[PDB]
Design an enzyme around this catalytic site. Sequence first.
Site, mmCIF file in Angstrom:
data_model
loop_
_atom_site.group_PDB
_atom_site.id
_atom_site.type_symbol
_atom_site.label_atom_id
_atom_site.label_comp_id
_atom_site.label_asym_id
_atom_site.label_seq_id
_atom_site.Cartn_x
_atom_site.Cartn_y
_atom_site.Cartn_z
ATOM 1 N N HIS A 41 0.802 -1.207 0.000
ATOM 2 C CA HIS A 41 0.000 0.000 0.000
ATOM 3 C C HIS A 41 0.847 1.274 0.000
ATOM 4 C CE1 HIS A 41 0.199 -1.451 4.218
ATOM 5 N NE2 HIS A 41 0.183 -0.176 4.555
ATOM 6 N N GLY A 143 4.296 6.840 9.351
ATOM 7 C CA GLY A 143 5.620 6.576 8.816
ATOM 8 C C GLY A 143 6.256 5.283 9.327
ATOM 9 N N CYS A 145 5.104 2.287 9.203
ATOM 10 C CA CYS A 145 4.802 1.128 8.375
ATOM 11 C C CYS A 145 6.085 0.599 7.744
ATOM 12 C CB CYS A 145 3.771 1.433 7.294
ATOM 13 S SG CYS A 145 2.098 1.662 7.957
HETATM 14 C C1 LIG Z 1 1.626 3.429 7.954
HETATM 15 O O1 LIG Z 1 2.775 3.791 8.283
HETATM 16 C C2 LIG Z 1 1.249 3.645 6.666
HETATM 17 N N1 LIG Z 1 1.061 4.902 6.218
HETATM 18 C C3 LIG Z 1 0.738 5.045 4.904
HETATM 19 C C4 LIG Z 1 0.516 6.202 4.241
HETATM 20 C C5 LIG Z 1 0.161 6.237 2.885
HETATM 21 F F1 LIG Z 1 -0.035 7.314 2.294
HETATM 22 C C6 LIG Z 1 0.044 5.048 2.190
HETATM 23 C C7 LIG Z 1 0.297 3.879 2.902
HETATM 24 C C8 LIG Z 1 0.627 3.872 4.211
HETATM 25 S S1 LIG Z 1 0.959 2.531 5.284
HETATM 26 C C9 LIG Z 1 0.438 3.490 8.984
HETATM 27 C C10 LIG Z 1 0.855 3.145 10.409
HETATM 28 C C11 LIG Z 1 -0.205 3.720 11.341
HETATM 29 C C12 LIG Z 1 0.016 5.190 11.392
HETATM 30 C C13 LIG Z 1 -0.375 5.496 12.818
HETATM 31 N N2 LIG Z 1 -0.131 4.251 13.538
HETATM 32 C C14 LIG Z 1 -0.037 3.272 12.652
HETATM 33 O O2 LIG Z 1 0.130 2.099 12.984
HETATM 34 N N3 LIG Z 1 -0.668 2.591 8.627
HETATM 35 C C15 LIG Z 1 -1.807 2.988 8.048
HETATM 36 O O3 LIG Z 1 -2.028 4.141 7.722
HETATM 37 C C16 LIG Z 1 -2.710 1.964 7.737
HETATM 38 C C17 LIG Z 1 -2.755 1.747 6.239
HETATM 39 C C18 LIG Z 1 -4.080 2.231 5.757
HETATM 40 C C19 LIG Z 1 -4.893 2.704 6.897
HETATM 41 N N4 LIG Z 1 -4.038 2.333 8.111
HETATM 42 C C20 LIG Z 1 -4.341 2.384 9.406
HETATM 43 O O4 LIG Z 1 -3.539 2.082 10.286
HETATM 44 C C21 LIG Z 1 -5.784 2.874 9.710
HETATM 45 N N5 LIG Z 1 -6.435 1.856 10.541
HETATM 46 C C22 LIG Z 1 -7.484 1.158 10.063
HETATM 47 O O5 LIG Z 1 -7.927 1.322 8.927
HETATM 48 C C23 LIG Z 1 -8.055 0.078 11.020
HETATM 49 F F2 LIG Z 1 -9.150 -0.415 10.540
HETATM 50 F F3 LIG Z 1 -8.329 0.631 12.366
HETATM 51 F F4 LIG Z 1 -7.041 -1.000 11.104
HETATM 52 C C24 LIG Z 1 -5.866 4.300 10.348
HETATM 53 C C25 LIG Z 1 -7.356 4.732 10.376
HETATM 54 C C26 LIG Z 1 -5.133 5.319 9.439
HETATM 55 C C27 LIG Z 1 -5.267 4.316 11.780
HETATM 56 C C28 LIG Z 1 -3.753 0.710 5.625
HETATM 57 C C29 LIG Z 1 -4.519 -0.302 6.512
HETATM 58 C C30 LIG Z 1 -3.468 0.103 4.217
#
Ligand SMILES: *[C@@](O)(c1nc2cc(F)ccc2s1)[C@H](C[C@@H]1CCNC1=O)NC(=O)[C@@H]1[C@@H]2[C@H](CN1C(=O)[C@@H](NC(=O)C(F)(F)F)C(C)(C)C)C2(C)C
EC number: 3.4.19.12
Lengths: 306, 306
Positions: A41, A143, A145
């Site tokens: 992603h 960040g 991820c």
């Molecule tokens: C991570 O680092 C990622 N960030 C991005 C940014 C982009 F633009 C594209 C792809 C990615 S992966 C995120 C790590 C989280 C940030 C805060 N704490 C974390 O663990 N992960 C995400 O943003 C992750 C990816 C999209 C939505 N994500 C979520 O963690 C979301 N949670 C949920 O949807 C649920 F259902 F609660 F699990 C959210 C609402 C942003 C916290 C994906 C799952 C693909």
Amino acid sequence: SGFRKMAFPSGKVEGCMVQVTCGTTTLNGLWLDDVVYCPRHVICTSEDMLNPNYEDLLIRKSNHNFLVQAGNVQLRVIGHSMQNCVLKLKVDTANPKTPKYKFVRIQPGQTFSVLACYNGSPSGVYQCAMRPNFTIKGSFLNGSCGSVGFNIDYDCVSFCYMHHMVLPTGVHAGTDLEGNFYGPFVDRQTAQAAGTDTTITVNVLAWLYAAVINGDRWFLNRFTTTLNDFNLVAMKYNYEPLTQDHVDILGPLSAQTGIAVLDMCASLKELLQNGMNGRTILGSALLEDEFTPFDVVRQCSGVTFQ
Amino acid sequence: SGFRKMAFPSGKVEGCMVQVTCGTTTLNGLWLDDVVYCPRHVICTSEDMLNPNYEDLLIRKSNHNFLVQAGNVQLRVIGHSMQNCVLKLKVDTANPKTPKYKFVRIQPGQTFSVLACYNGSPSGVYQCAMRPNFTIKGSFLNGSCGSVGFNIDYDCVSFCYMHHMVLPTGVHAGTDLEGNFYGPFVDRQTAQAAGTDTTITVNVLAWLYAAVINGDRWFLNRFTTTLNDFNLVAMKYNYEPLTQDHVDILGPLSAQTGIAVLDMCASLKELLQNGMNGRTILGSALLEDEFTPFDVVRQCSGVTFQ
Ligand SMILES: *[C@@](O)(c1nc2cc(F)ccc2s1)[C@H](C[C@@H]1CCNC1=O)NC(=O)[C@@H]1[C@@H]2[C@H](CN1C(=O)[C@@H](NC(=O)C(F)(F)F)C(C)(C)C)C2(C)C
Ligand SMILES: *[C@@](O)(c1nc2cc(F)ccc2s1)[C@H](C[C@@H]1CCNC1=O)NC(=O)[C@@H]1[C@@H]2[C@H](CN1C(=O)[C@@H](NC(=O)C(F)(F)F)C(C)(C)C)C2(C)C
């Protein structure tokens, strides 16, 4: 003496972390040989992850859309494949810091170390458990991820975890390095339930033994119990049922303390039943279940590696 | 989101750990440039540390009595000086993994990472605080001596701690890298009291803010208090008195949560007074005082280095 949540040294993994940029999205990747691994992603925009079609998204992407920085140095991407929820970018430069490494899907209850990164740079390192429900209680911001979890086995790094998301309970979810999620999680921004979480009974026993070993014994009792009777009271409390293997895995700690697993289980029973009455064990006022038997052995023996 | 005891990455320090043998005694040392640092009592026998005369002991020693192994490679020793409770061995080979480094004597309340070693090899890494009484609650077995504690400041390692001994309470004592003990401890096998330990009030506040930031707020109240009234109740409980600096150091967290330091102090007052009533904060059932303000900021912002 003493007893702490202790992570493996992070050196061998540090030299594998790189930054991966695709469009506006940047996250961490893992650079082993001539492959970089990161979450697929990375090809999504901050807002368009509600329900991606990753094939379709990826098809509009070419090697040259992928910016792999290692500190301050660009790797050229010369291949890209999607493996479940992970992207695998072939690069021209093989990592000359590649350690001996393998990829393992850990089992619930097993622990491992996390090297939390932002922009391919290490922030910090901490020890984690795969909860029975395939979440982890970590510390991840935006960040983070593509941050990886791992074990060291002498000189060999076993990567077991890549970070993908945070669930509504604030706990964390991610994949193995082949890109399959632990749990029923999907890489998309929807409401997702971690099921009910349970306590890793065997780990709590290991920790009680670690207490005994470190002179903390107040909670020992003058009772025993059966395996079956112990489990009857375990399940009341959402402890994972204990089995004969668990018994045998605790063997070394049993052996080193002279407390039969089932006498420890009797001590444990009355702690669930009567609580801790406001005392602590190894400075803790909760029953700690994120140390494996092996973790306790290593710590109470001094096991090293390199 | 999430919140954990997180150690700095250990890579830069790993490449500095060596094994130091003198007679039957082996412990860890720290190899920076053409100097190795270790505890001077490497020149004692397992049984004759009741009250050593270290001058006299050392005088019967020559460079060639000192066996410095780096993994599987001998360094030749070409000088030796005693600096307080530390031995400094000059060697012919400068460490080609020497990081940017400085030596700092930390202050009580400040935290740092420990890379616990046996035989010059890393076992594990964990985060620690210098208790107000200049002990640390760590995890050290035999052979752990000469293990170091450190901070990272971008690319620069600040070594602040070398491990020497375990006190009767099971807590740990050691020196700075110039070899002066933190505390009134001496490197000899006698009964030694750590004085009364106190809680690092400011750190507990930082942690309460970290809770708030991570959505845990139940313990917030509808009271405030004065600084003086707060300290009157602090001291009852062996909290270090809070000062205006403490207030100002908490500024960034105050700012980020909209909770004035003194409203947080009012929340805190009633927690000491009424206890936690069996709830938890950030999964903890005790008031945690081993995160600095800075520690909480870093964790809730994502600060990296290399
Ligand atoms: C991570 O680092 C990622 N960030 C991005 C940014 C982009 F633009 C594209 C792809 C990615 S992966 C995120 C790590 C989280 C940030 C805060 N704490 C974390 O663990 N992960 C995400 O943003 C992750 C990816 C999209 C939505 N994500 C979520 O963690 C979301 N949670 C949920 O949807 C649920 F259902 F609660 F699990 C959210 C609402 C942003 C916290 C994906 C799952 C693909
Ligand atoms: C460490 O690694 C060292 N071992 C040796 C062995 C030799 F043969 C020579 C020199 C050294 S330094 C020890 C680390 C402890 C092992 C178990 N947990 C530890 O933290 N440190 C010591 O052995 C240390 C050195 C002599 C006696 N030490 C103690 O830690 C002792 N404690 C005390 O004397 C007191 F008072 F409680 F602090 C003891 C009784 C062995 C636990 C010296 C202080 C120079």
